């Protein structure tokens, strides 16, 4: 299977400019394109991407178009310029996935054996991490469903490359509060609490919503399973979890005595140098 996918900034900007391509027709069009990459390992690599023609109307909303010939000749171009590069999958704009978002993979499984998708968001209202990626597997159920063919998410991030470092890290010039040390992580320390909160808000909204609508949706397998997983691991016990706190005292201990000893001595030594060069230049100046 896949360990995780590694998305580079170039493909995300190659989605943003694609939305700028089709932003003039406006009327009813999602962004859909084709993903390029490199199957490196169990981890996955992504280098390039490009467009595709695609449309979808209102009545009988299963009307969808993937030009094979565009794929053939333009993949011939990209293979002609780079032989290291080959196809790994596809992408679209992804507000979410709708019902028709299986047929694209079910077309191009005959190109990549595991045709992986990428769900992004061109509108950065997402205070989470963009570039979601699914992969389609089968999980055939105890109820005797014949074949449930469900996309499943494998985790994702934004990777690094030496030239794209030069690119991105020059294109920002905007914000740098880090001074990387005890405080490059505290902004993200607000982020981890707040972005557990957003996900939990989605959780409670979903839980309240399943009782009202979906007719009896409630997830029927993975509600009671993973809910009891939740209800099996909030350890708040008090027998030796209290007794981790002399190890907490030990955590305090080392840093207290390192700070208290060496910080004062170094600052004092600098005071020595400052006051020597202060008075010995004072007697020569005045």
């Amino acid at each position: 299977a896949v360990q995780k996918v590694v998305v580079h900034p170039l493909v995300l900007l190659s989605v943003v400019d694609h939305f700028n391509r089709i932003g003039k027709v406006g009327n009813q069009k999602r962004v859909v394109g084709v993903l390029l990459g490199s199957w490196q390992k169990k981890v996955l690599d992504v280098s390039n991407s490009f467009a595709v023609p695609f449309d979808e109307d209102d009545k009988d909303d299963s009307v969808w178009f993937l030009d094979h010939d565009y794929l053939e000749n333009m993949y011939g171009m990209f293979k002609k310029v780079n032989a290291r590069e080959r196809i790994v999958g596809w992408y679209h704009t992804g507000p979410k996935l709708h019902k028709n978002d299986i047929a694209i993979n079910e077309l191009m499984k005959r190109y990549c054996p595991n045709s992986v998708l990428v769900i992004i968001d061109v509108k950065p209202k997402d205070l989470g991490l963009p570039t979601e990626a699914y992969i389609s597997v089968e999980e055939v159920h105890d109820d005797g469903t014949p074949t449930s063919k469900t996309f499943e998410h494998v985790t994702s991030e934004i990777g690094a490359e030496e030239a794209e470092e030069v690119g991105v890290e020059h294109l920002l010039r905007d914000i740098k509060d880090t001074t990387v040390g005890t405080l490059s992580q505290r902004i993200t320390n607000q982020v981890h609490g707040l972005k557990g909160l957003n996900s939990k808000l989605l959780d409670i909204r979903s839980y309240l919503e399943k009782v009202a609508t979906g007719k009896l949706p409630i997830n029927h397998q993975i509600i009671y399973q993973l809910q009891d997983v939740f209800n099996l691991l909030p350890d708040v016990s008090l027998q030796e979890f209290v007794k981790a706190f002399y190890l907490k005292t030990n955590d305090q201990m080392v840093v207290v005595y390192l700070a208290s000893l060496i910080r004062s001595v170094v600052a004092l030594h600098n005071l020595i140098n400052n006051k020597i060069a202060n008075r010995d230049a004072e007697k020569k100046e005045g």
Partner: protein, 160 residues
Amino acid sequence: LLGEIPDRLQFRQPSLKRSLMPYFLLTQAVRTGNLAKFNQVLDQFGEKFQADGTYTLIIRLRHNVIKTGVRMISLSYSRISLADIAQKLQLDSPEDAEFIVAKAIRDGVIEASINHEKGYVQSKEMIDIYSTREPQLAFHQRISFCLDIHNMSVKAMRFP
């Protein structure tokens, strides 16, 4: 008047022994559990007290002396009889050993339990609510002080 006490002549001077030694004999008396050594020093150097203007020590320092004595002996003996510690600390009676040790509990010095049928004061020991609470509070003071050292050091270094 606290209960914790340092040795004073850590800054003793050759122009100081006269003005340290009766006062040092006073703290010598206090650093043991005895009170018969303590009661003699008032009548001894009450004229010195008239000079120094510090009469308020003698009205209330007996309290700290007996707290130090009972603290020491309570740390010594796991299970003590009141009718032994009372006469060992010249209390002259066993029934107010109940009173003094009862406020060694009420005042929070000792935890030690008593059967007031046989008159025995058993004491037990524990740790680890020490180590969960006690050192980190001191380390907070230590590092608040050393970061104040750092603050004053930089803000007085920066004149050049």
